[PDB]
Amino acid sequence: ASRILLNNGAKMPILGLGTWKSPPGQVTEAVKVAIDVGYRHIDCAHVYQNENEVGVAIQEKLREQVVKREELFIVSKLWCTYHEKGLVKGACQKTLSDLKLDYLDLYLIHWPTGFKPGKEFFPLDESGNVVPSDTNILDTWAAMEELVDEGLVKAIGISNFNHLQVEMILNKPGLKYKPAVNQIECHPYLTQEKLIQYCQSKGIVVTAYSPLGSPDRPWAKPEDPSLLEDPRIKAIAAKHNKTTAQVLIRFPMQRNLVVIPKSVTPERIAENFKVFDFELSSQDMTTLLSYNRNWRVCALLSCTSHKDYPFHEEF
Ligand SMILES: NC(=O)c1ccc[n+]([C@@H]2O[C@H](COP(=O)([O-])OP(=O)(O)OC[C@H]3O[C@@H](n4cnc5c(N)ncnc54)[C@H](OP(=O)(O)O)[C@@H]3O)[C@@H](O)[C@H]2O)c1
Ligand SMILES: O=C(O)CCc1cccc(-c2ccc([N+](=O)[O-])o2)c1
């Protein structure tokens, strides 16, 4: 099956196109190509600074009648500087305006860490520490629930929440809507078994981000581990007559995850979608899981003292 059922009753395509780091001059064509070759889920965020350009592509394909709005699954995320209850709606509305949509299929709290509101996405003190917000995440969640009730979003969820943070949302007094999704980093070097099992056991769908290990991350070092170049993964790919990237995308799919590889290269966008016609064996899956080394692409030193920093806990 190409979609997974969410706890709001909607179906979410298990493959989507990522857009973090997609240059604004290239992302419009990337999204157009993606839709042309079958993608029906785009992962966006205000902090990526390219939602207007993503929106241009979506709008053209809707106008062209290449795809109906009901067939698309568009995801965006509430940035850290908008956790205050009174800022949530405006942040969502700005994203809707940029994407040129009247609703989002899914809106995520991007990180559990709230930051001081202002123009800067990462407000810093004079010593380089991020400046936190005092807004309780449970209050941010209530504000997210209001978006469902106002028709701006069909589903709400969370991202980069650890198990205790997920539990805190699930245990919120007066909880109205459970989170539909937790979007987290996940790949063979950070397999996330514990957190995934917990989320799935609660009916929360997990989306795997950076499934290729984010080789274009700005802080990449030459000596870092590289999934795409791992000869063991290359060997599994060769056995199946697929590329290493295709194996890396298929892997989370077979764990009942959604996966959102990013590309702005038309040939790769197409390659990355050709993952529905082969199966990794259980042995392949266990072998890929065995490569776990708790290696994390996405975490910032500036945030490590924030009270809600998610990655101190084991999971
Ligand atoms: N919620 C969060 O906090 C969070 C954090 C990180 C990421 N995300 C989401 O997850 C998406 C994916 O993660 P990511 O962008 O970090 O990294 P990724 O999808 O793991 O890797 C993207 C990199 O892989 C390259 N690539 C793509 N397909 C390839 C292929 N078939 N062969 C070889 N190279 C290929 C891309 O190059 P080209 O583009 O040049 O083709 C790009 O450099 C993001 O774009 C974003 O939407 C969310
Ligand atoms: O958020 C995205 O989707 C991409 C930008 C990014 C990349 C890496 C890290 C953090 C980030 C935001 C907050 C923290 N933190 O460690 O608490 O890290 C944010």
Please answer whether residues 189 and 292 qualify as being in contact, where contact means their C-beta atoms are separated by less than 8 angstroms.
Answer: yes
Name the experimental technique.
X-ray
| CATH code at position 31 | 3.20.20.100
Pocket perturbation via mutation, ligand 1, pick of 17, 76, 206, 212 by most ligand atoms within 8 A of CB: 212
The residue annotated as part of the active site, out of 39, 48, 107, 209, is 48
Q: Which atom of ligand 1 is the closest one to the Cα of 211? A: 20
Nearest Cα residue to 77 out of 151, 183, 1? 183
Is 29 annotated to bind a ligand? Reply is no
107 catalytic? Reply is: no
Residue nearest to atom 26 of ligand 1 (CA): 263
Calpha distance 130→242 (Å, rounded):
43
- Report chain breaks in the chain, C–N > 2.5 Å, as residues after which they occur: none
The response to whether residue 131 sits with its C-beta less than 6 Å from ligand 2 reads no
Calpha distance 98→90 (Å, rounded):
12
Range of the domain at 40: 1-315
Question: In one letter, which amino acid is 278?
Answer: F
Residue nearest to atom 6 of ligand 2 (CA): 298
Calpha distance 72→12 (Å, rounded):
9
Is 237 annotated to bind a ligand? Reply is yes
Structural tokens at position 280: 């990794």
Q: Which atom of ligand 1 is the closest one to the Cα of 214? A: 17
Going by the DSSP 8-state scheme, the letter that residue 82 receives in this structure is: G
Q: Which atom of ligand 1 is the closest one to the Cα of 217? A: 16
* Four-CA torsion 113, 261, 45, 101, nearest 10 degrees: -140
Calpha distance 179→258 (Å, rounded):
15
Q: Which atom of ligand 1 is the closest one to the Cα of 261? A: 19
Going by the DSSP 8-state scheme, the letter that residue 313 receives in this structure is: S
Backbone angles phi, psi at 256, to 5 degrees: 65, 30
What do you get for the CA distance between the two ends of the chain, in Å?
29
Q: How many domains does the chain have?
A: 1
Pocket perturbation via mutation, ligand 1, pick of 262, 274, 297, 300 by most ligand atoms within 8 A of CB: 262
Is 282 annotated to bind a ligand? Reply is no
* Ligand 1 mean position, distance from CA 52 (Å): 19
Q: Which residues pair with 206 in a beta bridge?
A: 182
Ligand found nearest the CA of 245? 1
Backbone angles phi, psi at 119, to 5 degrees: -70, -30
Return left, alpha or beta for 27; rule: phi > 0 is left, psi -120 to 50 is alpha, else beta.
alpha
Is 138 annotated to bind a ligand? Reply is no
